[PDB]
Design an enzyme around this catalytic site. Structure first.
Site, short mmCIF file in Angstrom:
data_model
loop_
_atom_site.label_atom_id
_atom_site.label_comp_id
_atom_site.label_asym_id
_atom_site.label_seq_id
_atom_site.Cartn_x
_atom_site.Cartn_y
_atom_site.Cartn_z
N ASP A 1 78.62 22.99 83.68
CA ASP A 1 77.73 22.70 82.55
C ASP A 1 78.37 23.00 81.19
O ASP A 1 78.49 24.16 80.79
CB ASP A 1 76.44 23.52 82.70
CG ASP A 1 75.48 23.31 81.54
OD1 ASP A 1 75.50 22.23 80.93
OD2 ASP A 1 74.69 24.24 81.24
N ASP B 1 77.08 17.34 77.10
CA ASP B 1 76.39 18.31 77.96
C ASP B 1 76.38 17.86 79.43
O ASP B 1 75.51 17.10 79.84
CB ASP B 1 74.95 18.47 77.46
CG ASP B 1 74.18 19.59 78.15
OD1 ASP B 1 74.49 19.94 79.30
OD2 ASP B 1 73.24 20.12 77.52
C1 LIG Z 1 72.35 27.85 75.36
C2 LIG Z 1 71.04 27.78 76.21
C3 LIG Z 1 70.15 29.00 75.81
C4 LIG Z 1 71.45 28.00 77.70
C5 LIG Z 1 70.31 26.39 76.02
C6 LIG Z 1 68.91 26.22 75.82
C7 LIG Z 1 68.34 24.93 75.66
C8 LIG Z 1 69.15 23.77 75.72
C9 LIG Z 1 70.55 23.91 75.93
C10 LIG Z 1 71.48 22.69 76.00
N1 LIG Z 1 72.04 22.60 77.38
C11 LIG Z 1 71.15 22.48 78.57
C12 LIG Z 1 70.25 21.22 78.51
S1 LIG Z 1 69.05 21.31 79.84
O1 LIG Z 1 68.26 22.52 79.71
O2 LIG Z 1 68.38 20.02 79.94
C13 LIG Z 1 70.13 21.45 81.26
C14 LIG Z 1 71.00 22.75 81.16
C15 LIG Z 1 71.80 23.01 82.48
C16 LIG Z 1 70.88 23.09 83.71
C17 LIG Z 1 69.98 24.18 83.88
C18 LIG Z 1 69.11 24.25 85.01
C19 LIG Z 1 69.17 23.19 85.94
N2 LIG Z 1 68.47 23.01 87.07
C20 LIG Z 1 68.81 21.90 87.68
C21 LIG Z 1 69.78 21.27 86.99
C22 LIG Z 1 70.47 19.97 87.34
C23 LIG Z 1 70.23 18.88 86.26
F1 LIG Z 1 71.20 17.94 86.34
F2 LIG Z 1 69.01 18.30 86.43
C24 LIG Z 1 70.06 22.12 85.78
C25 LIG Z 1 70.93 22.05 84.67
C26 LIG Z 1 71.93 22.69 79.91
O3 LIG Z 1 72.65 23.93 79.79
C27 LIG Z 1 71.10 25.21 76.07
#
Ligand SMILES: CC(C)(C)c1cccc(CN[C@H]2CS(=O)(=O)C[C@@H](Cc3ccc4[nH]cc(CC(F)F)c4c3)[C@@H]2O)c1
Length: 376
Positions: free
Chosen positions: A35, A219
């Site tokens: 990620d 991302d």
């Molecule tokens: C820096 C942090 C506080 C972690 C933060 C908070 C809000 C948004 C972001 C930007 N990055 C985010 C965007 S997101 O929440 O849609 C997916 C996330 C990674 C993540 C987390 C749990 C998850 N559970 C299942 C998945 C698979 C996905 F592909 F559907 C998945 C992916 C990224 O990491 C970062």
């Protein structure tokens, strides 16, 4: 030698791409979501209905408890856990072992996916967005500090899934044509600037700052292309107009409804291509990446829907800026060149194409406008 790193990623559609890692001594094997949208390395470390294995700290003689709690709320999903350090390796990555921060996940909500086959997450972005705060050194920073590995990595995500994460160099076998670079605007997320958007070659004609309200990031952990409300609405209207011959459920464009066609009869040609122009390294120059419907209409794997070919609309609305997720990255070789603070795009070997159209990276394009497109 990057040949041994090739094809080290796996995944399911909509469920992310993961790499095998080991934690602890002796090494415990776990699959870990890759990620670029976060900066915490975190692994399941307690039983969960959706985990078939997890990190057992009591079985590692090199584990150290940092006696500090940690919480990360993503846009969707969250977990709580306990910080510590241990030895980490990537079996099909660089031949090195490093001591890194690891958040042992003890509680979670909508984080783990039933049947995803991964048990943790590797946040590859910068310390600025690490929790609990920016003093928690991210994994890649530790890797570069502790080894001789060059400060960059590349991702080749492939659609239905698999792909390659190459650490420390560029694998020219994984792309063709030219690599085009866009500057990292600021190192926290991998923030970039979009200067123009077209749907089937028609400009959306917005002030280009709207495309980056309030930031645009690359991302890999996010499935969809996510767009600011104003840009989303306009793009959906433009896409609707192109596919006007066929009507779809109201909830389809909301991502709440799937669209299915008889097996092998998906009318790809009725759907437009989408081009994102990214800021170039030279004044008022840009390049474009072009995305086909085979990318933004993503196949659903669920066996329950397998009688037909069903797809989910993989573009959605964002209140926190543009997110160029996996469906944007799929088919491209994407170089996260941290050493030179830029991100490169080239057509990968597994790029999307049919007989009439192809995903592409093209440039240079030039603009007379003197407005920077960065927001704030
Ligand atoms: C820096 C942090 C506080 C972690 C933060 C908070 C809000 C948004 C972001 C930007 N990055 C985010 C965007 S997101 O929440 O849609 C997916 C996330 C990674 C993540 C987390 C749990 C998850 N559970 C299942 C998945 C698979 C996905 F592909 F559907 C998945 C992916 C990224 O990491 C970062």
């Amino acid at each position: 030698s990057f040949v041994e790193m090739v094809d080290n990623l796996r995944g399911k559609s909509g469920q992310g791409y993961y790499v095998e890692m080991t934690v602890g001594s002796p090494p415990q094997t776990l699959n870990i979501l890759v990620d670029t949208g976060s900066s915490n390395f975190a692994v399941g470390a307690a039983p969960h209905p959706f985990l078939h294995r997890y990190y057992q700290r009591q079985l590692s003689s090199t584990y150290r408890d940092l006696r500090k709690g940690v919480y990360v709320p993503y846009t969707q999903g969250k977990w709580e856990g306990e910080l510590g350090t241990d030895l980490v390796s990537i079996p099909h990555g660089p031949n090195v072992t490093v001591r890194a921060n690891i958040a042992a996940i003890t509680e979670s909500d909508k984080f783990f996916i039933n049947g995803s086959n991964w048990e943790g997450i590797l946040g590859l972005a910068y310390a600025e967005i690490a929790r609990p705060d920016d003093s928690l050194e991210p994994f890649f920073d530790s890797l570069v500090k502790q080894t001789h590995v060059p400060n960059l990595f590349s991702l080749q995500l492939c659609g239905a899934v698999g792909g390659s994460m190459i650490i420390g160099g560029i694998d020219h076998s994984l792309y063709t044509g030219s690599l085009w670079y866009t500057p990292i605007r600021r190192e926290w997320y991998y923030e970039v600037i979009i200067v123009r958007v077209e749907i089937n070659g028609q400009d959306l004609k917005m002030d280009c700052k709207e495309y980056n309200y309030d930031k645009s990031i690359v991302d890999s952990g996010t499935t969809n292309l996510r767009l600011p409300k104003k840009v989303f609405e306009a793009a959906v209207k433009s896409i609707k107009a192109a596919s006007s011959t066929e009507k779809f459920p109201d909830g389809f464009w909301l991502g709440e409804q799937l669209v299915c066609w008889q097996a092998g009869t998906t009318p790809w040609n009725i759907f437009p291509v989408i081009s994102l122009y990214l800021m170039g390294e030279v004044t008022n120059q840009s390049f474009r990446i072009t995305i086909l419907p085979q990318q933004y209409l993503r196949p659903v794997e669920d066996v329950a829907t397998s009688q037909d070919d069903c797809y989910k609309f993989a573009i959605s609305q964002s209140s926190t800026g543009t997110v160029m997720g996996a469906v944007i990255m799929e088919g491209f070789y994407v170089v996260f060149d941290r050493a030179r603070k830029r991100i490169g795009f080239a057509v990968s070997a597994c790029h999307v194409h049919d007989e009439f159209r192809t995903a592409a990276v093209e440039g240079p394009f030039v603009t007379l406008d003197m407005e920077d497109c960065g927001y704030n």
